[PDB]
Design a binder for this molecule. Structure first.
Ligand SMILES: O=C(c1ccccc1)c1ccccc1
Length: 149
């Protein structure tokens, strides 16, 4: 039986729009935890991001929607789904529509710390590829996460 709630740290992110994931972009997200509250149909997300190269922390609350998808407001509107779950990782697929109306598809591989299991990494590359995102649009987040624990 799986527990999806708990500490989750980003290892890699892929994006159909590179403007959304480099240095200080809104979706270069360093996850810290995700709590799924199925009783209240909500999800709680805590993570760091950088603006001005300095770490900033966010705690968001999303709403459970149809088909195990969640809606959450952050740099526009987001609809995401936990596409894959193992005992060591989560792969999340997110569609963002920003304030300008531009749509971006992104994937993220999450784990319990810094030591990546290749089996989880191969699944992340396949989900990324399936979403039309090229290999070169993958950023290594563990290498860039120097925000507090
Ligand atoms: O792109 C997101 C994401 C980034 C890394 C892992 C999981 C999800 C995201 C989705 C919804 C809200 C905030 C951030």
């Amino acid at each position: 039986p799986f527990e999806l709630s708990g500490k989750w740290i980003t290892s890699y992110i892929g994006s159909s729009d590179l403007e959304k994931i480099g240095e200080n972009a809104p979706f270069q997200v360093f996850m810290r935890s995700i709590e799924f509250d199925d009783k209240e149909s909500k999800v709680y997300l805590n993570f760091f991001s950088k603006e001005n190269g300095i770490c900033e922390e966010f705690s968001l609350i999303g709403t459970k929607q149809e088909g195990n998808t969640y809606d959450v407001n952050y740099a526009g509107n987001n609809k995401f789904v936990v596409s894959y779950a193992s005992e060591t990782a989560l792969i999340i697929s997110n569609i963002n529509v920003d304030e300008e109306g531009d749509k971006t598809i992104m994937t993220g591989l999450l784990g319990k710390g810094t030591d990546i299991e290749d089996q989880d990494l191969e699944k992340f590359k396949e989900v990324t590829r399936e979403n039309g995102i090229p290999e070169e649009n993958i950023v290594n987040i563990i290498e860039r996460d120097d925000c507090p624990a």
